[PDB]
Structure formats: C-alpha cells, structure tokens
C-alpha cells in the first residue's frame, strides 16, 4: 500500500469537492521541499506527499500522522 489511502482521500477533495475549501491543484513550497495542494481556504493550503498529508498555514508546514487527519481538519480551521 502508499497511494491508497492518500489516494482516496485527495479525490475527496480533487473530483468529489472539499468542504468550504476552494478546489486549488497547485503545489506548495515549505521545509526546503514542494508539497502538493488539493485545496485552499484562506491562507491554508492543505497538500500530500507519498506518505502522509501537510497543512501549510501561509509558511507552517503541519505534517498529519495520516491521511484521515486532514479530512477532519477540512470541517475544523
């Protein structure tokens, strides 16, 4: 497994529709590393790697300890 859970949760976002969060395929630069957005609400940039998800808060990178993280963090802040 690895594109299976962070698989099925960026489709969520990408195809399916986030919350309250705009719909954004660009890609993020934090930590000296890129990171890949699915969406955007405010100044949050919610992005994926191979392993786990981030929310970059502007410059914050806020590594997720998995991917199901992130989709509860879309309905909170």
């Known amino acids: ?7 099925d ?3 969520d ?4 529709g986030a919350r309250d969060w705009d719909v954004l395929q660009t890609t993020c630069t934090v930590d000296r590393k890129v990171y890949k957005t699915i969406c955007k609400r ?8 191979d392993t786990n998800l981030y929310a970059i808060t502007g410059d914050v990178v806020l590594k997720f300890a998995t ?4 989709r509860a963090y879309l309905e909170t802040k």
């Open 9 to 11: 949760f960026v489709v």
């Open 1 to 7: 497994s690895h594109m299976t859970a962070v698989q």
């Open 67 to 70: 991917v199901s993280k992130a």
């Open 13 to 16: 976002i990408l195809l399916n």
């Open 42 to 49: 405010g100044n949050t940039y919610l992005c994926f790697d």
